[PDB]
Amino acid sequence: NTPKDQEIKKLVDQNFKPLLEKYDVPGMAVGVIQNNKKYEMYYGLQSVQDKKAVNSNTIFELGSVSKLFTATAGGYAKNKGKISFDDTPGKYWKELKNTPIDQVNLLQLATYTSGNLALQFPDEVQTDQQVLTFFKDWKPKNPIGEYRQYSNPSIGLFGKVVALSMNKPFDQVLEKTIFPALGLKHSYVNVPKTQMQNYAFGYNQENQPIRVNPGPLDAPAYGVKSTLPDMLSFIHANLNPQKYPTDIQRAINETHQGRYQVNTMYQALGWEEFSYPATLQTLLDSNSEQIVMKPNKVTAISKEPSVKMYHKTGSTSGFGTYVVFIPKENIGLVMLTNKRIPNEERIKAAYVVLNAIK
Ligand SMILES: *[B@]([O])([C]N1[C]=C(C([O])=O)N=N1)OP([O])([O])=O
């Protein structure tokens, strides 16, 4: 009596559409996948000044959602026997052999527990030589493996090592191995010249057009750009890893395994994981200022839930992202915007929508 696509569109109109007026967001793409059926909704503008509408070809910056691809690459490397997560970075980047950072293992780098790595590198660290010097000069502070501090250089180094173990630069690991194994045709570390017309402007807090800056180990930490249909296919792969060849299948499953907890949030590789059903507050608590910006002592997982859900937020100066999936209900959602909006508004809108869909 109302077809499913219109029902889902109404729910997205009720929950996501009013964020555009509220936060003055020029463009948004929202997608839902349910049982192998894809629903794409597009709003507004990819470029205000060009009058170019958001559409299925629009390329957005994923920000930290990029960490999911880095995690998947690490899982691919591990399950191919190219790395072990108990290895240290000096085994692959030989100039770090026997330095203090070589006491930190790959898993601890992927999951932000070195005990002394902050959200960003210092501004001055830009070149490959400066990055190396930075890690050579690094010294411990907190006990290794016990304190989570969410960190671009931590998972950046992880990404770098993964690339070294596969004998390819990190951009090539994604663009030539991992994106094609996931079936993504419109995802990039470096958007090529012939695709730049599809690359949206981001918009800052004064609605001024901006794009992400080049940075040290930017690609593995926050450097991937993709379209809505590609992101939906990524969510499809996470929902149905058993439909992919062994190597990328094991890779995807590797990203799902929780390693530790901070209260109700289980840190997997890239993904944050929760006991399902999850309350809205549990999901909101995961991205509190205290969790995101400060050190938190981790605990051993002492209740492993049978059924989980998984999410990740991403932001660049000019773009917001949120991806969530619930294997049990065979359903997932992607939101891409070309202006940041509060993490709380993303998580809540997707919660309402996903819980309402018949
Ligand atoms: B990632 O995109 C990393 N990130 C966020 C910021 C910021 O707030 O400026 N800098 N780096 O996003 P997140 O915090 O995991 O959603």
Side-chain angles (χ1 to χ4, degrees), residues 2-9 11-20 22-35 37-51 53-128 130-184 186-192 194-288 290-302 304-343 345-358:
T2 300
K4 180 60 93 53
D5 65 350
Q6 292 183 34
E7 292 171 333
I8 290 178
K9 160 69 164 161
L11 288 163
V12 174
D13 281 349
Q14 285 167 332
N15 290 289
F16 281 90
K17 191 184 180 182
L19 299 171
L20 282 92
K22 182 172 183 178
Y23 293 103
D24 201 15
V25 177
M28 171 180 286
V30 181
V32 171
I33 178 148
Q34 181 187 39
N35 296 134
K37 274 162 196 304
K38 286 172 181 167
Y39 304 92
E40 317 179 3
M41 289 110 333
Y42 301 99
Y43 301 91
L45 301 178
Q46 83 164 66
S47 167
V48 178
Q49 73 196 249
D50 305 304
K51 296 159 176 133
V54 175
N55 61 90
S56 71
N57 302 309
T58 309
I59 299 161
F60 297 81
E61 297 172 0
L62 300 180
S64 289
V65 158
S66 304
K67 298 182 180 57
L68 309 181
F69 290 106
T70 308
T72 304
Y76 182 95
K78 185 258 197 179
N79 285 288
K80 290 193 88 256
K82 305 304 189 68
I83 62 176
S84 167
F85 290 164
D86 292 308
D87 292 340
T88 66
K91 185 162 195 275
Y92 303 97
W93 200 355
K94 311 296 193 163
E95 294 80 357
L96 293 182
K97 190 98 63 52
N98 303 118
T99 62
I101 190 73
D102 203 33
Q103 302 299 113
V104 182
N105 74 33
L106 299 190
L107 187 53
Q108 299 163 335
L109 296 178
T111 58
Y112 325 113
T113 65
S114 72
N116 195 22
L117 281 185
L119 180 64
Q120 309 292 357
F121 287 101
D123 283 317
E124 66 163 2
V125 171
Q126 293 294 327
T127 66
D128 316 335
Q130 290 156 352
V131 170
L132 171 54
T133 296
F134 175 91
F135 289 122
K136 292 184 85 181
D137 290 356
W138 187 91
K139 287 175 166 48
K141 178 154 90 85
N142 295 329
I144 301 159
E146 288 186 7
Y147 295 76
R148 176 188 191 276
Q149 168 124 68
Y150 181 70
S151 180
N152 291 323
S154 191
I155 192 178
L157 184 53
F158 178 79
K160 216 246 189 284
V161 167
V162 163
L164 289 171
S165 84
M166 290 171 65
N167 314 291
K168 268 180 264 282
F170 186 82
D171 72 303
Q172 293 299 293
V173 167
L174 294 186
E175 284 180 2
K176 298 286 215 271
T177 313
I178 302 307
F179 296 158
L182 295 158
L184 317 183
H186 289 296
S187 301
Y188 312 96
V189 178
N190 296 302
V191 168
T194 31
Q195 281 292 327
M196 279 298 287
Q197 76 281 15
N198 291 317
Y199 187 176
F201 281 118
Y203 292 93
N204 70 4
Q205 298 308 294
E206 302 100 286
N207 282 58
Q208 292 295 6
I210 194 173
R211 291 194 180 114
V212 71
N213 286 328
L217 308 187
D218 55 1
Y222 55 79
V224 176
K225 299 104 193 178
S226 186
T227 66
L228 186 63
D230 268 14
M231 291 310 296
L232 285 173
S233 292
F234 187 55
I235 293 312
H236 180 267
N238 281 268
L239 286 169
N240 300 277
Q242 77 288 356
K243 304 184 149 159
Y244 291 76
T246 302
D247 289 341
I248 197 73
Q249 166 206 127
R250 285 173 165 154
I252 289 163
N253 287 321
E254 191 75 40
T255 75
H256 298 178
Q257 300 321 308
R259 310 296 173 151
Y260 65 71
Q261 77 196 91
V262 182
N263 191 33
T264 47
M265 179 188 87
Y266 296 78
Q267 183 64 72
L269 227 64
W271 298 98
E272 308 171 9
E273 162 189 15
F274 310 87
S275 188
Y276 187 80
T279 66
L280 174 56
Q281 193 68 44
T282 290
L283 303 177
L284 296 177
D285 280 344
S286 73
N287 278 275
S288 76
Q290 175 65 30
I291 297 310
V292 172
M293 303 297 283
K294 283 164 180 155
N296 297 277
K297 198 158 182 302
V298 307
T299 56
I301 287 171
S302 67
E304 173 68 355
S306 167
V307 185
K308 296 99 151 165
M309 63 174 293
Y310 298 90
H311 83 186
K312 186 69 189 83
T313 55
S315 290
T316 56
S317 55
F319 288 85
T321 309
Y322 181 74
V323 302
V324 56
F325 73 97
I326 308 162
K328 152 72 175 254
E329 302 307 312
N330 247 101
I331 200 175
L333 180 146
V334 179
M335 191 209 74
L336 310 172
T337 59
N338 65 350
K339 184 179 173 185
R340 302 164 75 137
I341 67 168
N343 289 331
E345 300 271 29
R346 308 176 204 183
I347 293 170
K348 175 170 92 195
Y351 188 84
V352 178
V353 169
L354 288 183
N355 286 287
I357 288 172
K358 299 149 163 188

Coordinates of all heavy atoms in Angstrom, one line a residue, residues 124-162, unseen atoms left out:
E124 N 54.5 20.8 11.9 CA 55.8 20.8 11.1 C 56.1 19.5 10.5 O 56.9 19.4 9.5 CB 56.9 21.3 12.1 CG 57.2 20.3 13.2 CD 58.6 20.6 13.8 OE1 59.3 21.6 13.4 OE2 59.0 19.9 14.8
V125 N 55.5 18.4 11.0 CA 55.8 17.1 10.4 C 55.0 17.0 9.1 O 53.8 16.9 9.1 CB 55.4 15.9 11.3 CG1 55.5 14.6 10.6 CG2 56.3 15.9 12.6
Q126 N 55.7 17.0 8.0 CA 55.0 16.9 6.7 C 55.7 15.8 5.8 O 55.0 14.9 5.3 CB 55.0 18.3 6.0 CG 54.1 19.3 6.7 CD 52.6 19.0 6.6 OE1 52.1 18.4 5.7 NE2 51.9 19.4 7.6
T127 N 57.0 15.9 5.6 CA 57.6 15.0 4.6 C 57.8 13.6 5.3 O 57.8 13.4 6.5 CB 59.0 15.5 4.3 OG1 59.8 15.5 5.4 CG2 58.9 17.0 3.7
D128 N 58.2 12.6 4.4 CA 58.4 11.3 4.8 C 59.6 11.2 5.8 O 59.6 10.5 6.8 CB 58.7 10.3 3.6 CG 57.7 10.6 2.4 OD1 56.6 11.0 2.6 OD2 58.1 10.2 1.3
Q129 N 60.6 12.1 5.6 CA 61.8 12.1 6.5 C 61.4 12.7 7.9 O 61.9 12.2 8.9 CB 62.9 13.0 5.9
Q130 N 60.6 13.7 7.9 CA 60.1 14.3 9.2 C 59.2 13.3 10.0 O 59.2 13.3 11.2 CB 59.3 15.6 8.9 CG 60.3 16.7 8.5 CD 59.6 17.8 7.7 OE1 58.5 17.7 7.3 NE2 60.4 18.8 7.4
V131 N 58.4 12.5 9.3 CA 57.6 11.4 9.9 C 58.5 10.4 10.5 O 58.4 10.0 11.6 CB 56.7 10.7 8.8 CG1 56.0 9.5 9.4 CG2 55.6 11.7 8.4
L132 N 59.6 10.0 9.7 CA 60.5 9.0 10.3 C 61.2 9.5 11.5 O 61.2 8.8 12.6 CB 61.5 8.5 9.2 CG 62.6 7.6 9.7 CD1 62.1 6.4 10.5 CD2 63.4 7.1 8.5
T133 N 61.7 10.7 11.5 CA 62.4 11.4 12.6 C 61.4 11.4 13.8 O 61.8 11.1 14.9 CB 62.8 12.8 12.2 OG1 63.8 12.6 11.1 CG2 63.4 13.5 13.3
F134 N 60.2 11.8 13.5 CA 59.1 11.8 14.6 C 59.0 10.5 15.4 O 59.0 10.5 16.6 CB 57.8 12.3 14.0 CG 56.7 12.3 15.0 CD1 56.4 13.4 15.8 CD2 55.9 11.1 15.2 CE1 55.4 13.3 16.8 CE2 54.9 11.1 16.2 CZ 54.6 12.2 16.9
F135 N 58.9 9.4 14.6 CA 58.8 8.0 15.3 C 60.1 7.5 15.9 O 60.1 6.8 16.9 CB 58.2 7.0 14.3 CG 56.7 7.3 14.1 CD1 56.2 7.5 12.8 CD2 55.8 7.2 15.1 CE1 54.9 7.7 12.6 CE2 54.5 7.4 14.9 CZ 54.0 7.7 13.7
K136 N 61.2 7.9 15.3 CA 62.6 7.6 15.9 C 62.8 8.2 17.2 O 63.4 7.7 18.1 CB 63.7 8.1 15.0 CG 63.8 7.4 13.6 CD 65.0 7.9 12.8 CE 66.3 7.1 13.3 NZ 67.5 7.6 12.6
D137 N 62.2 9.5 17.3 CA 62.4 10.3 18.5 C 61.3 10.0 19.6 O 61.5 10.4 20.8 CB 62.4 11.8 18.1 CG 63.6 12.3 17.3 OD1 64.6 11.5 17.1 OD2 63.7 13.5 16.9
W138 N 60.3 9.3 19.2 CA 59.2 8.9 20.1 C 59.7 8.2 21.3 O 60.5 7.3 21.2 CB 58.2 8.1 19.4 CG 56.9 7.8 20.1 CD1 55.8 8.5 20.1 CD2 56.7 6.6 20.9 NE1 54.9 7.8 20.9 CE2 55.4 6.7 21.4 CE3 57.5 5.5 21.2 CZ2 54.9 5.7 22.2 CZ3 57.0 4.6 22.0 CH2 55.7 4.7 22.5
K139 N 59.1 8.5 22.5 CA 59.3 7.8 23.7 C 58.0 7.5 24.4 O 57.0 8.2 24.2 CB 60.2 8.7 24.6 CG 61.6 8.7 24.2 CD 62.5 9.7 25.0 CE 64.0 9.4 24.7 NZ 64.3 9.3 23.3
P140 N 57.9 6.3 25.1 CA 56.7 6.0 25.8 C 56.3 7.0 26.8 O 57.1 7.8 27.3 CB 57.1 4.7 26.5 CG 58.6 4.7 26.7 CD 59.1 5.4 25.5
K141 N 55.0 7.0 27.2 CA 54.5 7.7 28.4 C 53.7 6.7 29.3 O 54.1 6.2 30.2 CB 53.8 9.0 28.0 CG 53.3 9.8 29.2 CD 53.1 11.3 28.9 CE 51.8 11.6 28.4 NZ 50.8 11.8 29.5
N142 N 52.4 6.5 28.9 CA 51.6 5.5 29.6 C 52.0 4.1 29.2 O 52.6 3.8 28.1 CB 50.2 5.8 29.2 CG 49.7 7.2 29.7 OD1 50.2 7.6 30.7 ND2 48.8 7.9 29.0
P143 N 51.8 3.2 30.2 CA 52.0 1.8 29.9 C 51.3 1.3 28.6 O 50.1 1.6 28.3 CB 51.2 1.1 31.1 CG 51.3 2.1 32.2 CD 51.3 3.4 31.6
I144 N 52.2 0.7 27.8 CA 51.8 0.2 26.5 C 50.6 -0.8 26.5 O 50.5 -1.7 27.4 CB 53.0 -0.3 25.6 CG1 54.0 0.9 25.5 CG2 52.5 -0.8 24.3 CD1 55.4 0.4 25.2
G145 N 49.6 -0.5 25.7 CA 48.5 -1.3 25.5 C 47.4 -1.0 26.5 O 46.4 -1.6 26.4
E146 N 47.5 -0.1 27.4 CA 46.5 0.1 28.4 C 45.6 1.3 28.3 O 44.5 1.3 28.9 CB 47.2 0.1 29.8 CG 47.7 -1.3 30.2 CD 48.2 -1.2 31.7 OE1 48.1 -0.2 32.4 OE2 48.8 -2.3 32.1
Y147 N 46.0 2.4 27.6 CA 45.3 3.6 27.4 C 45.0 3.9 26.0 O 45.9 4.0 25.1 CB 46.0 4.8 28.0 CG 46.2 4.7 29.6 CD1 47.1 3.8 30.1 CD2 45.3 5.3 30.5 CE1 47.2 3.6 31.5 CE2 45.4 5.1 31.8 CZ 46.3 4.3 32.4 OH 46.5 4.0 33.7
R148 N 43.7 4.1 25.7 CA 43.3 4.4 24.4 C 43.3 5.9 24.2 O 42.6 6.7 24.9 CB 41.9 3.9 24.1 CG 41.3 4.3 22.7 CD 39.9 3.8 22.6 NE 39.3 3.9 21.3 CZ 38.8 5.0 20.7 NH1 38.8 6.2 21.4 NH2 38.3 5.0 19.5
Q149 N 44.1 6.4 23.2 CA 43.9 7.8 22.8 C 43.8 7.8 21.3 O 44.7 7.5 20.6 CB 45.1 8.6 23.3 CG 45.1 10.0 22.6 CD 45.2 11.1 23.6 OE1 46.2 11.3 24.3 NE2 44.1 11.9 23.8
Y150 N 42.6 8.2 20.8 CA 42.3 8.2 19.4 C 43.3 9.1 18.7 O 43.5 10.3 19.0 CB 40.9 8.6 19.2 CG 40.4 8.6 17.8 CD1 40.2 7.4 17.2 CD2 40.0 9.8 17.2 CE1 39.7 7.4 15.9 CE2 39.4 9.8 15.9 CZ 39.3 8.6 15.3 OH 38.8 8.6 14.0
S151 N 43.9 8.5 17.6 CA 45.1 9.0 17.1 C 45.3 8.8 15.6 O 45.5 7.6 15.1 CB 46.3 8.4 17.8 OG 47.5 8.9 17.3
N152 N 45.4 9.9 14.8 CA 45.8 9.7 13.4 C 47.2 9.1 13.1 O 47.3 8.2 12.4 CB 45.6 11.0 12.6 CG 44.1 11.3 12.5 OD1 43.3 10.5 12.3 ND2 43.7 12.6 12.5
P153 N 48.2 9.6 13.9 CA 49.6 9.0 13.6 C 49.7 7.5 14.0 O 50.5 6.8 13.5 CB 50.5 9.8 14.5 CG 49.7 10.8 15.3 CD 48.4 10.8 14.7
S154 N 48.9 7.1 15.1 CA 48.9 5.7 15.4 C 48.5 4.7 14.3 O 49.2 3.8 13.9 CB 48.1 5.6 16.8 OG 48.3 4.3 17.3
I155 N 47.2 5.0 13.8 CA 46.7 4.1 12.8 C 47.4 4.4 11.4 O 47.6 3.5 10.6 CB 45.2 4.0 12.7 CG1 44.7 2.9 11.9 CG2 44.6 5.4 12.3 CD1 43.1 2.8 11.8
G156 N 47.9 5.7 11.2 CA 48.8 6.0 10.1 C 50.0 5.2 10.0 O 50.4 4.6 9.0
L157 N 50.7 5.0 11.1 CA 51.9 4.1 11.2 C 51.5 2.7 10.9 O 52.3 2.0 10.2 CB 52.6 4.2 12.5 CG 53.9 3.4 12.6 CD1 55.0 3.7 11.5 CD2 54.6 3.7 14.0
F158 N 50.4 2.2 11.5 CA 49.9 0.9 11.1 C 49.7 0.8 9.7 O 50.2 -0.2 9.1 CB 48.6 0.6 11.9 CG 48.0 -0.7 11.5 CD1 48.5 -1.8 12.0 CD2 46.8 -0.7 10.7 CE1 47.9 -3.0 11.7 CE2 46.2 -1.8 10.5 CZ 46.7 -3.0 11.0
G159 N 49.0 1.7 9.1 CA 48.8 1.7 7.6 C 50.1 1.6 6.8 O 50.2 0.9 5.8
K160 N 51.0 2.5 7.1 CA 52.4 2.5 6.5 C 53.0 1.1 6.6 O 53.6 0.7 5.6 CB 53.3 3.5 7.2 CG 54.3 4.2 6.2 CD 55.7 3.9 6.5 CE 56.7 4.7 5.7 NZ 56.8 4.2 4.3
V161 N 53.0 0.4 7.7 CA 53.6 -0.9 7.9 C 52.9 -1.9 7.1 O 53.5 -2.8 6.4 CB 53.6 -1.3 9.5 CG1 53.9 -2.8 9.6 CG2 54.6 -0.5 10.2
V162 N 51.6 -1.9 7.1 CA 50.8 -2.8 6.3 C 51.2 -2.6 4.8 O 51.5 -3.6 4.1 CB 49.3 -2.5 6.4 CG1 48.5 -3.2 5.3 CG2 48.8 -3.0 7.8

